């Protein structure tokens, strides 16, 4: 709901993917690292298929 996450942020280590059944992009920004962009919105993304989860 009102999701506005993007491949910019996500989580460095998780493979950002969209529930549709297709990959979006790879882990590029850690929650701990300042490498986010709160501007865009990717309603297609669903989660990040990490090696850990």
Short mmCIF file of C-alpha atoms in Angstrom, two decimals:
data_model
loop_
_atom_site.label_atom_id
_atom_site.label_comp_id
_atom_site.label_asym_id
_atom_site.label_seq_id
_atom_site.Cartn_x
_atom_site.Cartn_y
_atom_site.Cartn_z
CA UNK A 1 0.00 0.00 0.00
CA UNK A 2 1.40 3.40 -1.08
CA UNK A 3 4.71 1.58 -1.67
CA UNK A 4 7.52 3.76 -3.03
CA UNK A 5 10.60 1.54 -2.69
CA UNK A 6 13.20 1.41 -5.47
CA UNK A 7 16.27 -0.57 -6.57
CA UNK A 8 18.28 2.42 -5.30
CA UNK A 9 17.58 1.49 -1.68
CA UNK A 10 16.34 -2.12 -1.18
CA UNK A 11 19.14 -3.87 0.88
CA UNK A 12 22.79 -4.46 -0.17
CA UNK A 13 22.92 -8.26 -0.43
CA UNK A 14 19.34 -8.99 -1.59
CA UNK A 15 18.26 -9.49 -5.21
CA UNK A 16 15.38 -7.02 -5.56
CA UNK A 17 12.57 -8.72 -7.44
CA UNK A 18 8.92 -8.15 -8.36
CA UNK A 19 6.15 -10.59 -7.36
CA UNK A 20 5.02 -10.77 -11.02
CA UNK A 21 7.69 -13.46 -11.43
CA UNK A 22 10.62 -11.32 -12.62
CA UNK A 23 13.85 -9.96 -11.12
CA UNK A 24 14.15 -6.15 -10.80
CA UNK A 25 17.82 -5.56 -9.81
CA UNK A 26 20.59 -6.64 -7.40
CA UNK A 27 21.41 -5.57 -3.84
CA UNK A 28 22.96 -2.08 -4.09
CA UNK A 29 22.16 -0.11 -0.86
CA UNK A 30 22.48 -1.31 2.73
CA UNK A 31 20.03 -0.07 5.44
CA UNK A 32 23.18 1.00 7.32
CA UNK A 33 24.77 2.78 4.33
CA UNK A 34 23.41 6.18 3.08
CA UNK A 35 22.73 4.99 -0.50
CA UNK A 36 18.95 5.51 -0.74
CA UNK A 37 16.79 7.76 -2.99
CA UNK A 38 13.38 8.55 -1.36
CA UNK A 39 11.91 10.11 -4.54
CA UNK A 40 10.91 7.36 -6.99
CA UNK A 41 8.26 4.66 -6.47
CA UNK A 42 8.34 1.07 -7.79
CA UNK A 43 4.89 -0.55 -7.12
CA UNK A 44 6.03 -3.59 -9.16
CA UNK A 45 8.74 -4.59 -6.64
CA UNK A 46 7.60 -7.05 -3.94
CA UNK A 47 10.74 -8.01 -2.00
CA UNK A 48 14.42 -8.98 -2.27
CA UNK A 49 15.36 -12.63 -2.82
CA UNK A 50 18.48 -12.66 -0.62
CA UNK A 51 20.86 -15.69 -0.38
CA UNK A 52 19.95 -15.67 3.33
CA UNK A 53 16.22 -15.37 2.51
#
